[model samples]
Target: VINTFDGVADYLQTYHKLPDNYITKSEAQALGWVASKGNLADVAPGKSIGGDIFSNREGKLPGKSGRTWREADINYTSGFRNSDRILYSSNWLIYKTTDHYQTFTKIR
Candidate 1:
């Protein structure tokens, strides 16, 4: 049920887990989502975009061997999505960015 910057960060920081409300991109796609519209709201109700591998392509975050990251959506509403996203490393490091992936703020 968490979908905001602080909400997701707090949830991951305290629980160290992605909540059940999150769905992977593939899952969303199977449910009729697209990279363009992110139409998960119309296809599946009460689910947010997330749970996909996030390659540290930009090298903005801390980098190390064998450390992978995952992503989730935030500020999504009314079948419309924003640039806001939550990125979490496999080791439970949480980060949030409102301007897509241009920058990031570590949460936990």
Candidate 2:
């Protein structure tokens, strides 16, 4: 990993040698876990990531990952329903097994 989050370091790491979005490796890894085989189903756009918490506390600005997803609806008569509509924006918790009910610790 790079030593610091300084702009110079980031510029050098991103522009000279590293590939695009390579600096997001950790994010990708965390999100990968969030996007696990079954996770894709529950993840829809514009929904709160905290809505899918495995533990309590629901949402405390605790989303760690995000992706564009959609949900299907069968109700057509009410006119308030649509099938597979785009969510526009959504987020997810990277570590599902982790206890979001309490405080979280930072590694870097």
In the range 1-108, model 2's lDDT, one tens digit per residue, is 222223223333345332132322233335542533434223322221221113222453343444432111111122222231111123311221123124332211
**Per-residue lDDT over 1-108 for candidate 1, one digit per residue giving the tens place of the 0 to 100 score:** 577778887887778777788888788888888768757778878888788888878899889889988888886764666788899986788888888799999877
Worst 10 residues of 1 by lDDT: 74-83
Candidate 2 deviant stretches above 4 angstroms: 1-97
TM-score of each model, paired residue for residue: 0.86, 0.16
TM-score of model 1 vs. true structure? 0.86
> Model 1's lDDT to the true fold?
0.82
Model 1 regions lying over 4 Å from their true place: none
Evaluate residue 23 in candidate 2 and report its C-alpha lDDT on the 0 to 100 scale. Answer: 21
- C-alpha lDDT of all candidate models, in order: 0.82, 0.26
